[PDB]
């Protein structure tokens, strides 16, 4: 793929990439790549075409761009904007697989700056009504097309940008006759046109009159919408008119006239069109065929000469190449003339300064509705406009302000500690704590918060033997299971630890499971909560202070008492929900306990709470 | 032939393509072994080469938890270590363009635990596990199964291609082929990354299922206000904070939450970062496995899993780890959780594990639906869903289109190759700037006339013709201040006075009316491009009109000096004139030659037959 690579790296100053409608069933799509010399011939009669040659293979000779003003050759009048007749000799021609080629095209920002229609929707509606009332309504003819132009500016234009637009069009648009980027030096063209102008192969000429448009809803095409479209009298008349008008042209170019087939629905990305085909036989010279078919009635109107006059009366600007022709003129294997040509609609012309002009119109008929015709022009430019400014470039749903706010709110009224930088983040200063893990690594989190209070910490397991003299305070940790299940070895072992710490008067703080076990040791009932408090933030009164704490428990201790006296222990102060009797925490003579998890991300001010709990536990130490 | 080319051609018996984070895909190949433990991963002693370098890709199965002393249904899945002997990167778009498509339809596609059985398990976990203190959240796996016909790694490459083009918001998208087993997935969740001492985890839970029609802002907001989904995410955050507190001496710092948007769902997630200096093998052992795919507390979760799953997990909830070195010699780890992943055996049997975080307020039917949403992108990558139109091939569209050809002209649909009294009659057709004349000529030739077309302004010798056809054109037939219209008046007056047979169409019909004294009027609704049924001199016909002006009269006959009696075909209600028959001429308002006229050639033939009546 050396030609393609050279077009890509700037080494082919004049080039065309054309993805055509020739491929078959389960074939990969291919892109024709052309390069050669540009010239500006002074008429169609002077296209630089050699005498007949045969190679044994199909071969293209020239790519010709015919502007609207070329109608002077038919003696018709036109606003002359100086758009030249352009011919590119096809000195080189290669084909490349679509997928590989597209992969090699680098993306580029092609957002259209100062994007606007030269004739805005309200002004365009008024023109449409004038054409219907003052042209159709006075006998100029039956249908006409009036161009308006979508305009914008490309920042920092180079043909790389045009290749990027072409790439998007190839990835998104369907139902096109050609998708192309043609760079002539003077100008760049990028488009996705649904309509051949004229083809010729082995004396067989084909035209494709297309009119009637179903605009897809943003949510997509539907069967009800397409059925209502195909039952619409205006849309069906419109197609019949352009069929008649292409039959006229075929009757002039082909001595036995044209034969119609179809109609067919052509489906594109943002709209569908109804179309017919016409075929016939001709042996006229390509130059004469091109001249005599300038330009299709689907993009001017009918009768053709009267349409040129309506067009001139209502368009202030010239048309450039809008409604014109891109024509590949060639030879077949054995030397007969070949023509493949497309109508220049759904196309951007980009000038050397990066200014983009996208011409668009619609077939206006006696029963046209001006507002619907405005909407039809937006539908027709939608795929090319999207190729410049893809709607997926816009902000994601995740960036919507309601989503960002909802996400930020999750962080309000939860633990500050865990959001603080790594490190980052007292009577307790000297203090050594042993944390006994009962098979829940919440312990590691209790240890980090205790360390921030100034304690040195060590973690063991329930089943280990330790020397308690090395510690000032023991933390009895959380864990799974039912605190009443004393025939589980691990739970039984928790009972033995708590009974020993109580009996020794060793300061301790009991968390969740160990809090529950402590309650049972002190004679307070345990019960299963009907709705488990497993992973919930609950506001509680904790010994006269309102706190917001994280719970992970299915079971709870329950009592009517705020204070009790317990044998072998002394007075135990109880913080409880006054409505249910559920126990939140205990303060005893040499210990504290909590049902909730101070260390959880769901506790507000966990370290302070843990500090208060430990401070209480060591109250008898001197 | 680069590495990627060899992978593509079947030349690498073990390979991985991994698209991580101009998107690039990492391509790896080398030697496979199944070490017996994490401690025995074949990792060399440190080297600083001056560039980043990957050493091993490791697949850690669920049963590897025996190394933590936890119990699992042991299915013998190996710890898989692939040495990265070769490592190349290839542009994603280029790579995908080179992968050939292949049929990957899943045969006998079904979940091993069906929706009803899975909803029952969910309720049992909530009532009997969460409800009896086993812990706060758990994940129960079920498996979507199916069979691939004629399996080879080419097929997995085809699945990977589709996942890469359709799935978004993934952490890794991958195909990893070991020889015995292929893994293809698009997981949203890193397991653990380590870069320059910085460890990161990504607790994800809470899922918004997209409607078939697509995500909406109203749907997202209602999801983000759902207390169950919010609690679920907090729980997994706590549980990863535990893990980070064990592997990082100063613990983890939380950032987020963020909404991760995928193709068929979105998740809520947090991140947690901290510093660690542990050996990578110890980091991997101690973090088996994330609480987002097991539950909490972790050991209790392994027991809950074992109580309710009969099958082993394979590599579901396990880890894919790339272990390496940075430029300066420091350890690197990038690892992803194996969810949203297909494991495929040599026979082409596909297993796709999926579960959801069950919590106290879970709804069993919603959890079932959540498992469907999570497998949707992967399942679509095997069996892409139907189009979204094919409108042109819809039977109602095809019928509507075929009906456009009924009750219009036959002539223009006949082969151009194959389509008395008038035989050899010569017609001159005078064009007034509407090439309908070319169509009239074709129809007249089919009747056997010889025809010639000239322009209005030409000088002609009328002796060479038997009949003149005065053609249609634009403009107002009452506008004798237009040179072309004036010239048509002169032609009709000359033909009338010479008694030359003629037939006038549309504009010329109107002018003829004016010359004969019959008023012209402008129609308020123009008859421009419309098929109308008329009575044409006693015969109902269907004909195509293209006119804005029309002649109008109360009379069925008019007597005109210089002419004689002219018979008028008109709408009896409105007086609108359709046609004339005079002593040496006929005329029609409509276009017999149009596609909108039924039996145009016959009508033309009648009109010409009448016109030449005085000749013989
Ligand atoms: Mg006016
Ligand atoms: Mg239209
Ligand atoms: Mg969930
Ligand atoms: Zn708890
Ligand atoms: Zn007419």
Question: H-type helices in B455-527, by residue range?
Answer: 483-498, 507-515
Residues B559 and B583: their CA atoms lie apart, in Å, by 11
Task: Report in angstroms the alpha-carbon separations of B337 from A445, B20, B61, B265, B267.
Answer: 24, 13, 11, 18, 15
Cβ neighbour number for residue B66 with a 10 Å cutoff: 11
Residues A444, B242: C-beta atoms closer than 8 Å: yes
Residue B402: count of CB within 10 angstroms of its CB: 11
Do A139 and B473 contact (CB within 8 A), yes or no?
no
Is B569 within 8 Å of B532 (Cβ atoms)?
Answer: no
- CA–CA distance, B579 with B565 (Å, rounded to integer): 14
Suggest the residue from B304, B412, B547 to mutate for an interface test with chain A (most A CBs closer than 10 A): B412
Per the omega criterion (within 30 degrees of 0), is the bond before A4 cis? no
Q: Checking DSSP bridges between strand A591-594 and strand A508-511, what pairing results, if any?
A: parallel
Q: Report whether B305 contacts B296 (CB < 8 A).
A: no
**Residues contacting residue A548 through CB under 8 Å, at least 6 positions apart:** A413, A537, A538, A539, A540, A603, A604
What secondary structure, in 3-state letters, does B187-218 show? ECCECCEEECCEEEECCEEEEEECCCCCCCHH
Distance CA B488, CA B479 (A): 11
Distance A66 CA to ligand 2 centre (A): 24
CB contact under 8 A, A602 and B93: no
| Closest CA–CA distance from residue B230 to any residue of chain A (Å) | 8
Q: Which of A103, A306, A403 sits opposite B224 (nearest CB)?
A: A403
For the CA atoms of A149, A152, A156, A159, what is the dihedral angle to 10 degrees? -30
Which ligand sits nearest to residue A215's alpha carbon? 2
B221 Cα to the center of ligand 5, angstroms: 61
Q: Select from A268, A251, A273, A252 the least CA-distant residue to A260.
A: A251
Concerning whether A599 is annotated as a catalytic residue, the answer is yes
Cross-chain Cβ contact B438/A251 below 8 Å: yes
Interface test with B, best of A75, A214, A251 (most B CBs within 10 A): A251
**Radius of gyration from C-alpha coordinates of chain B:** 42
Distance CA A136, CA A141 (A): 5
Q: Say whether B133 and A239 touch across the interface (CB within 8 A).
A: no
CB B260 within 8 A of CB B269: yes
CA–CA gap between residue B41 and residue B281 (Å, rounded): 8
Long-range contacts for A578-584 (Cβ within 8 Å, ≥24 apart)? A578/A541, A582/A529, A582/A556, A582/A557, A582/A558, A583/A519, A583/A524, A583/A556, A583/A557, A583/A558, A583/A559, A584/A540, A584/A541, A584/A542, A584/A549
Interface contact A420-B253, CB threshold 8 A = yes
Q: Measured at the alpha carbon of residue A322, what is the angle toward residues A317 and A324, in degrees to the nearest 5? A: 125
Q: Residue A487 in contact with residue A475, Cβ under 8 Å?
A: no
Q: For residue B520, give both structure tokens.
A: 């012209």
Q: Which of A490, A505, A489 is nearest to A438 (CA)?
A: A490
Contacts B273 to A, Cβ<8 Å: 422
Q: Specify the resolution in Å.
A: 2.1
B contacts of A535 (beta carbons < 8 Å): 136-137, 231-232, 234-235, 238, 359-360
Distance CA(B397)–CA(A275), nearest Å, equals 13
Assigned token pair, B99: 């992968």
C-alpha dihedral sign at B473, B474, B477, B482:
negative
Ligand nearest to the CA of A376: 2
Which is it for strands A143-145 and A38-39: parallel, antiparallel or unpaired?
unpaired
Residue A61 in 3-state DSSP? strand
B367 in Cβ contact with B119 (< 8 Å): yes
Q: For chain B, what percentages of helix, strand and coil (3-state, to nearest 5) are there? A: 30, 30, 35
DSSP string, A273-328: EEEEEEEEE----HHHHHHHT-S-GGGSEESHHHHHHHHHHH-SS--TTTT-EEEE
Tell me, yes or no, if B359 comes closer than 8 A to chain A by beta carbon: yes
Report the gap between the CA of A12 and the closest CA in chain B (Å): 23
Active-site residues of B, by number, are 506, 591, 593
Beta bridge partners of B507: none
CA A412, CA A400: separation in Å to the nearest integer?
19
Tokens describing residue A353? 């300064």
* β-pair type (B564-570, A188-193): unpaired
Which residue bears the tokens 């510690």? A471
Distance CA B132, CA A395 (A): 46
- B259 lies within 8 A of chain A by CB: yes
Q: Are B52 and B330 in contact (CB under 8 A)?
A: no
- β-strand partners of B591: B544
From A279's Cα to the closest Cα of chain B, the distance in A is: 9
**Domains by residue range for chain B, with CATH:** 1-385 (3.60.120.10), 425-616 (3.40.50.880)
- Separation of CA A544 and ligand 4 centre (Å): 22
d(CA B363, CA B123): 8
Inter-chain touch A601–B237, beta carbons under 8 Å: yes
Q: Strands A432-437 and A473-476, how do they pair?
A: parallel
Give which of B378, B379, B339, B62 is closest to B204, Cα–Cα: B339
Rounded to whole angstroms, the Cα distance separating B390 from A380 reads: 20
The residue among B405, B446, B450, B418 whose CA lies nearest residue B603 is B446
d(CA A136, CA B527): 10
Q: Is B533 annotated as a binding residue?
A: no
In a 10 Å sphere around its CB, with 0-12 CB exposed, 13-18 middle and 19+ buried, how is residue B46 labelled? exposed
Contacts of residue B473 in chain A, CB cutoff 8 Å?
303
Q: Which residues of A sit in the known binding site for Zn(2+)?
A: 512, 552, 597
User: Which two tokens mark A334?
Assistant: 């054995």
Task: Judge: A407–B438 Cβ closer than 8 Å, yes or no.
Answer: no
Residues 48-67, chain B, touching A (beta carbon < 8 A): none
CA–centroid distance, A150 to ligand 5, in Å, is 35
User: A256: which 2 tokens?
Assistant: 């036995």
Active-site position among A90, A254, A431, A512: A512
Q: Please count the residues of chain B.
A: 616
A186: annotated active-site residue = no
Strand order in the sheet with B15-20: B86-91, B24-29, B15-20, B172-177, B181-187, B341-345, B349-354, B142-147, B107-111
| Strands A92-97 and A59-66, sheet pairing | unpaired
Beta bridge partners of A508: A474, A591
Please, which residues bridge with residue A89 across strands? A62
Structure tokens at A125: 């509606």
Torsional sign, CA A262, A268, A273, A279: negative
Q: Do residue B526 and residue A136 have CB atoms under 8 angstroms apart?
A: yes
Tokens 């909407």 identify what position?
A375
Helix (H, G, I), strand (E, B) or coil at B533: strand
Task: State the residue for tokens 């297909």.
Answer: B342
B370 is an annotated ligand-binding site residue:
yes
- Residue A360's nearest CA partner among A372, A371, A344 is A344
How big is the CA angle at B610 (ends B606 and B611), to the nearest 5 degrees? 120
Q: Solved how?
A: X-ray
Contacts of B577 (CB under 8 A, 6+ apart): B513, B518, B550, B551, B552, B553, B568, B569, B570, B589
- Which helix (DSSP H) or strand (DSSP E) does residue B230 occupy? helix B227-247
C-alpha B526: how far from chain center: 42
Q: Is B299 on the interface with A (CB under 8 A)?
A: yes
Task: Give burial (CB, 10 Å; 0-12/13-18/19+) of B318.
Answer: buried
Residue A264, phi then psi, degrees to nearest 5 = -135, 155
- Tell me which residue has tokens 């192969």: A201
Q: Which ligand is nearest to the CA of A133?
A: 1
Å from CA of B123 to ligand 4 middle: 22
Measured in whole angstroms, the distance separating CA A440 from the mean position of its chain's CA atoms is 43
Cβ contact B558:B518 at 8 Å: yes
Distance of alpha carbon B341 from its chain centroid, rounded? 25
Q: What per-residue string of b and e applies to B460-481 under the rule 16 or more CB within 10 Å gives b?
A: eeeeebbbbbbbbbbbbbbeee
C-alpha of A378 from chain center: 20
Count of A-B CB contacts under 8 Å? 296
- What is the C-alpha separation between A130 and B238, in angstroms, rounded? 71
| Cis, bond preceding A263 (omega within 30 deg of 0) | yes
Beta-bridge partner residues of B354: B142
Angle in degrees, CA B178, B183, B189, rounded to 5: 125
From CA A336, how far away is CA B61, in angstroms rounded? 68
Whether the Cβ atoms of residue B262 and residue B170 lie closer than 8 Å to each other: yes
C-alpha to C-alpha distance for B86 and B98, rounded to whole angstroms: 20
As a whole number of Å, the end-to-end CA separation of chain B is 89
Three-state secondary structure of A199-263: EEECCEEEECCEEEEEECCCCCCCHHHHHHHHCCHHHHHHHHHHHHHHHHHHHHHCCCCCEEEEE
Task: Centre a 10 Å sphere on the Cβ of residue A541 and count the other Cβ atoms it contains.
Answer: 13
Q: Closest by alpha carbon to B375, among B155, B109, B72, B20?
A: B109
Task: Write out the two tokens for A493.
Answer: 């072992």
Centre of ligand 3 from the C-alpha of residue B355, in Å: 9
User: Are A486 and A495 in contact, with CB atoms under 8 Å apart?
Assistant: yes
Neighbour order of strands in the sheet with B137-139: B295-296, B137-139, B357-358
Q: DSSP code of B8?
A: H
Q: Degrees (nearest 5) of the Cα angle B89, B90, B92?
A: 125
Residues 6+ apart with CB under 8 A from A326: A63, A64, A65, A66, A178, A180, A182, A189, A197, A341, A342, A344
Chain A residues with CB inside 8 Å of B526's CB?
A: 136-137, 139, 366
């Amino acid at each position: 793929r050396n030609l393609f690579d050279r077009v890509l790296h700037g080494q082919a100053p004049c080039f065309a990439l054309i993805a055509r409608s020739t491929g078959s069933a389960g074939e990969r799509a291919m892109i024709d790549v052309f390069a050669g010399a540009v010239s500006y011939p002074s008429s169609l009669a002077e296209l630089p075409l050699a005498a007949p040659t045969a190679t044994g293979a199909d071969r293209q000779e020239l790519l010709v761009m015919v502007p609207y003003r070329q109608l002077h050759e038919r003696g018709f009048k036109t606003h002359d904007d100086g758009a030249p007749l352009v011919a590119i000799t096809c000195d080189e021609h290669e084909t490349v697989s679509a997928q590989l080629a597209l992969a090699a095209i680098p993306d580029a920002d092609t957002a259209l700056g100062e994007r606007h229609f030269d004739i805005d929707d309200e002004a365009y509606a008024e023109i449409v009504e004038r054409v219907i009332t003052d042209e159709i309504g006075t006998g100029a003819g039956s249908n006409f097309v009036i161009k308006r132009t979508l305009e914008g500016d490309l920042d920092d234009y180079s043909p790389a940008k045009a290749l990027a637009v072409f790439k998007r069009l190839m990835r998104r648009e369907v139902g096109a006759y050609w998708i192309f980027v043609i760079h002539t030096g003077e100008r760049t063209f990028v488009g996705a046109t649904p309509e051949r102008h004229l083809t010729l192969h082995e004396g067989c000429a084909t035209m494709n009159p297309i009119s009637g448009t179903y605009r897809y809803p943003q949510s997509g095409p539907t069967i009800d919408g397409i059925n209502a479209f195909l039952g619409d009298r205006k849309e069906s008349d419109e197609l019949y008119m352009v069929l008649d008008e292409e039959l006229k042209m075929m009757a002039r170019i082909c001595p036995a006239g044209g034969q119609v087939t179809g109609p067919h629905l052509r489906e594109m990305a943002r709209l569908a069109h109804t179309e017919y085909f016409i075929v016939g036989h001709t042996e006229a010279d390509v130059r004469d065929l091109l001249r005599e078919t300038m330009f299709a009635p689907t993009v001017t109107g009918s009768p053709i000469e009267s349409a040129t006059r309506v067009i001139a009366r209502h368009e202030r600007a010239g048309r450039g190449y809008y409604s014109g022709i891109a024509a590949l003129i060639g030879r077949d294997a054995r030397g007969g003339r070949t023509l493949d040509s497309a109508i220049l609609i759904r196309t951007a012309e980009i000038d050397r300064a990066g200014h983009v002009r996208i011409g668009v119109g619609s077939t206006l008929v006696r029963h046209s509705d001006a507002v619907s015709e405005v909407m039809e022009t937006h539908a027709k430019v939608a795929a090319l406009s999207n190729a410049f400014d893809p709607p997926e470039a816009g902000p994601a749903l995740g960036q919507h302000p309601s989503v960002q706010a909802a996400l930020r709110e999750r962080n309000e009224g939860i633990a500050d500690f865990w959001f603080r930088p790594y490190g980052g983040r007292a009577e307790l200063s000297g203090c050594r704590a042993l944390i006994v893990d009962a098979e829940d690594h919440f312990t590691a989190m209790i240890a980090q918060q205790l360390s921030s209070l100034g304690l040195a910490t060590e973690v063991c397991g329930v089943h280990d033997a330790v020397d308690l003299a090395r510690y000032d305070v023991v933390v009895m940790g959380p864990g799974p299971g039912d605190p009443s299940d004393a025939g589980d070895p691990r739970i039984a072992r928790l009972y033995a630890w708590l009974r020993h710490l109580i009996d020794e008067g060793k300061p301790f703080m009991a968390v969740c499971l160990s809090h529950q076990i402590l309650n049972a040791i002190l004679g307070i009932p345990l019960v299963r909560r009907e709705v488990p408090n497993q992973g919930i933030q609950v506001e509680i009164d904790l010994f006269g202070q309102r706190e917001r704490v994280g719970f992970y428990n299915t079971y709870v201790a329950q009592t009517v008492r705020d204070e009790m006296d317990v044998d072998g222990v002394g007075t135990v102060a109880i913080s409880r929900d006054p409505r249910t009797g559920e126990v939140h925490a205990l303060r005893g003579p040499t210990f504290s306990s909590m049902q909730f998890h101070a260390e959880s991300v769901l506790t507000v001010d966990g370290p302070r709470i843990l500090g208060e709990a430990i401070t209480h536990a060591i109250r008898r130490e001197k």
